[PDB]
């Protein structure tokens, strides 16, 4: 690139205008993007905005790891374990059994054990197009209760089949994250308590540190009135 | 640098699933010195990533952004730390204000006296902690210190 743009926020208004393009000229914007992208990169599904993005595990009806039947497609009536979701598109990438496309690929992105440039790759698919399985497929799932998961380490909801709430579709237990990194502090030290609220006389963090912690010349923090000030103000 | 590498590969980097930024609650029960150390470690990490990120963007013209994401995450933890530092000071100030109101302070002292002091079924240890907590008396001189001494004398007389 030879840019330097990344070390600053210059031409901010222009960037905002470009970034927040009007939605009725979104086809115009993306037409040229589509053209630019090669076949193996580009996706058919609409790149949804971060507002309309499934952040919660309730908003996603399915998690990476669970088993799902595909429908409304070429590879329909096919069971597939969903591998990973795409965040920008609001869609899932399924395993080998799911929907795919055969596309030419350059030798930069060649897998070990390839004869041809042609490679089959999995297309993204929406949560609307595929239904759960348990063999019995599920029409729709609803969430009514919640609980702390041991493996996920989150207060996740209970996936219950729509109609009869007692038939729980359980979450897929994820793979064990064997953490061995120098930049992650271990559980014992991460949580060990070294502070206690003890003193009322001595303040906990020093007076010379305050200017870093908060702006002492803050235009927002208005001063309170006094009697003398009132008297001065009023005729 | 990190392990004397011109650039951390994808394998050399810490993976996203294994890594989490600090929680504000977790930070809240850490000492000042510890927090300061953490902050400086974060800053160091950012510098390492910033060097690398710059190289990636300026020279090779990449859009891989793992380094950038890491830097952002670190920045998040830093501001959370900054917030908890401010919050602690504010809490202290509020406590001071509360104590300054005389009746409330008196009530608090009475409450302290009733439950744990002057009771049976340790006391010295409580007093030493209480001394530090409420007055300027460790094991230098002020009106507050004098008041604490007087209170201690009163407690002794009672007991």
């Amino acid at each position: 690139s030879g840019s330097y743009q990344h070390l600053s926020n210059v031409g901010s208004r222009v960037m905002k205008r470009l970034g927040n393009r009007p939605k009725n000229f979104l086809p115009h914007s993306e037409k040229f993007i589509k053209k630019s992208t090669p076949e193996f990169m580009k996706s058919d599904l609409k790149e949804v905005d971060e507002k309309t993005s499934f952040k919660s595990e309730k908003e996603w009806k399915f998690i990476p790891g669970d088993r799902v039947v595909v429908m409304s497609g070429a590879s329909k009536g096919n069971i597939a374990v969903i591998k990973s979701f795409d965040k920008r598109t609001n869609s899932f990438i399924l395993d080998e059994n799911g929907p795919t496309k055969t596309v030419p690929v350059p030798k930069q992105f060649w897998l070990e054990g390839q004869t041809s440039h042609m490679i089959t790759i999995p297309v993204s698919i929406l949560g609307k197009d595929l239904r759960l399985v348990a063999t019995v497929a599920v029409r729709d799932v609803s969430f009514n209760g919640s609980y702390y998961d041991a493996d996920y380490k989150k207060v996740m909801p209970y996936r219950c089949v729509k109609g009869q709430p007692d038939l729980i579709i359980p979450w897929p237990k994820p793979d064990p994250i064997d953490v061995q990194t120098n930049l992650a502090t271990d559980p014992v030290i991460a949580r060990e308590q070294t502070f206690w609220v003890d003193s009322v006389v001595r303040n906990p963090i020093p007076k010379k540190a305050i200017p870093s912690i908060r702006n002492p010349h803050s235009k927002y923090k208005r001063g309170t009135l006094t009697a003398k000030d009132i008297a001065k103000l009023v005729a | 640098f990190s392990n004397k590498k011109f650039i951390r590969s994808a394998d050399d980097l810490p993976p996203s699933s294994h890594i989490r930024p600090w929680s504000i609650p977790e930070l809240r029960h850490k000492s000042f010195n510890d927090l300061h150390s953490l902050w400086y470690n974060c800053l160091r990490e950012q510098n390492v990533l910033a060097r690398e990120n710059h190289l990636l963007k300026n020279i090779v013209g990449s859009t891989h952004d793992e380094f950038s994401e890491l830097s952002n995450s670190i920045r998040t933890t830093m501001w959370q730390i900054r917030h908890v530092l401010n919050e602690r000071e504010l809490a202290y100030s509020a406590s001071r204000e509360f104590l300054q109101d005389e009746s409330e302070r008196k009530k608090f002292l009475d409450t302290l006296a009733n439950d744990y002091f002057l009771n049976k079924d340790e006391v010295a240890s409580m007093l030493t902690r209480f001394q530090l907590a409420i007055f300027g008396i460790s094991e230098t001189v002020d009106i507050n210190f004098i008041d604490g001494i007087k209170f201690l004398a009163n407690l002794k007389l009672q007991r």
């Binding site: 193996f40 990169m41 990973s84 795409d86 990438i93 790759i121 | 994808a10």
Partner: peptide, 15 residues
């Protein structure tokens, strides 16, 4: 999406 898939494939190959 493709890039992420490719990365996953590489990881699988490695392990």
């Amino acid at each position: 999406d493709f890039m992420s898939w490719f990365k996953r494939k590489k990881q699988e190959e490695h392990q």
